[PDB]
């Protein structure tokens, strides 16, 4: 789908999603086409029509580069987004690790980013269920105990995860809070069950 | 009683005409309000079919 240059293999995402146009049913969309062939002067004509419209798209379809969630091999590639819906992940030839290469997961593994059961609310457990509650109470608590457990047993009491799903910046200050802030050497990643040795 | 023609107006302040000015709206859009109420439910039609985005991206490129 990506090194196709036409049409011909292309990800079912974009279809109906990129143009202005593409949304009407093929019922409809159909003899559009054939009125239009049959129209037709000439194909600089219509072409300049369909480049004005491709100019358009520019307002709805954001191209962003990022850098693949999933594994280490570091591939690199445009994400095309019409608001929250992402149409495909476009790999540039000038991705320094993979170039136009990706695999199912960075190519077409992006649902969850959407996913009905993400959290966007802090938690607090309440019993035998958790509580939504705001972002202030979930930090304030975070605050209370860390304090109270520091002050009562001490700054190594405390154990810290990094996320190598994380940036560099996000491990970074996890373990600036780790041990500039609590003050213990607690810190680790998941690189701990995987290349150590 | 005696003759007088003086005659001390009533403050009518800046932000009491404000009220009033735009109370003023308000009433023309309650009078008016099946007329806006239709108007905006062809504007959602405008927005769902291709019409609305189409427009915003034809001036905004
Ligand atoms: C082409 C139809 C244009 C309709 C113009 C509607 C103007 C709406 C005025 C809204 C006034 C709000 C009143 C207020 O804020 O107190
Ligand atoms: C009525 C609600 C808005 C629908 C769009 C109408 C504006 C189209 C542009 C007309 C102004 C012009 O370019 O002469
Ligand atoms: C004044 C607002 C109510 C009149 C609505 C105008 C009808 C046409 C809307 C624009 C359609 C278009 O430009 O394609
Ligand atoms: S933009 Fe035109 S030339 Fe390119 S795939 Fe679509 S129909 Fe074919
Ligand atoms: S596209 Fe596939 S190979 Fe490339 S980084 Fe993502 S998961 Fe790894
Ligand atoms: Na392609």
Same mark, same amino acid.
């Given at each position: 789908?990506?090194?196709?240059? #036409?049409?011909?293999?292309?990800?079912?995402?974009?279809?109906?999603?990129?143009?202005?146009?593409?949304?009407?049913?093929?019922?409809?969309?159909?003899?559009?086409?054939?009125?239009?062939?049959?129209?037709?002067?000439?194909?600089?004509?219509?072409?300049?029509?369909?480049?004005?419209?491709?100019?358009?798209?520019?307002?709805?379809?954001?191209?962003?580069?990022?850098?693949?969630?999933?594994?280490?091999?570091?591939?690199?590639?445009?994400?095309?987004?019409?608001?929250?819906?992402?149409?495909?992940?476009?790999?540039?030839?000038?991705?320094?690790?993979?170039? /136009?290469?990706? #695999?199912?997961?960075?190519?077409?593994?992006?649902?969850?980013?959407?996913?009905?059961?993400?959290?966007?609310?802090?938690?607090?457990?309440?019993?035998?269920?958790?509580?939504?509650?705001?972002?202030?109470?979930?930090?304030?608590?975070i605050?209370?105990?860390?304090?109270?457990?520091?002050?009562?047993?001490?700054?190594?009491?405390?154990?810290?995860?990094?996320?190598?799903?994380?940036?560099?910046?996000?491990?970074?200050?996890?373990?600036?809070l780790?041990?500039?802030?609590?003050?213990?050497?607690?810190?680790?990643?998941?690189?701990?069950? #995987?290349?150590?040795? | 009683?005696?003759? /007088?023609?003086?005659?001390?107006?009533?403050?009518?302040?800046?932000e009491?005409?404000?009220?009033?000015?735009?109370?003023?709206?308000?009433?023309?859009?309650?009078?008016h309000?099946?007329?806006?109420?239709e108007?905006?439910?062809?504007?959602?039609?405008?927005?769902?079919?291709?019409?609305?985005?189409?427009?915003?991206?034809?001036?905004?490129?």
């Amino acid at each position: 789908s990506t090194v196709c240059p #036409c049409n011909a293999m292309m990800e079912k995402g974009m279809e109906g999603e990129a143009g202005y146009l593409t949304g009407i049913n093929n019922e409809t969309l159909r003899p559009m086409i054939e009125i239009t062939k049959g129209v037709e002067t000439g194909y600089g004509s219509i072409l300049a029509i369909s480049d004005m419209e491709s100019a358009m798209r520019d307002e709805r379809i954001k191209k962003t580069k990022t850098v693949c969630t999933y594994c280490g091999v570091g591939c690199s590639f445009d994400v095309w987004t019409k608001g929250r819906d992402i149409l495909k992940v476009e790999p540039q030839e000038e991705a320094p690790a993979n170039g /136009i290469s990706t #695999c199912v997961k960075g190519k077409f593994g992006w649902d969850f980013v959407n996913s009905e059961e993400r959290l966007t609310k802090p938690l607090i457990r309440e019993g035998d269920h958790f509580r939504e509650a705001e972002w202030e109470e979930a930090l304030l608590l975070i605050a209370s105990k860390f304090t109270e457990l520091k002050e009562a047993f001490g700054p190594d009491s405390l154990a810290f995860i990094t996320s190598s799903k994380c940036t560099n910046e996000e491990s970074y200050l996890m373990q600036k809070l780790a041990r500039g802030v609590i003050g213990t050497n607690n810190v680790d990643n998941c690189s701990r069950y #995987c290349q150590s040795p | 009683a005696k003759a /007088i023609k003086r005659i001390q107006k009533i403050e009518v302040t800046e932000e009491d005409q404000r009220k009033r000015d735009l109370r003023e709206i308000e009433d023309a859009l309650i009078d008016h309000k099946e007329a806006i109420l239709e108007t905006l439910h062809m504007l959602g039609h405008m927005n769902e079919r291709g019409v609305l985005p189409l427009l915003r991206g034809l001036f905004g490129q």
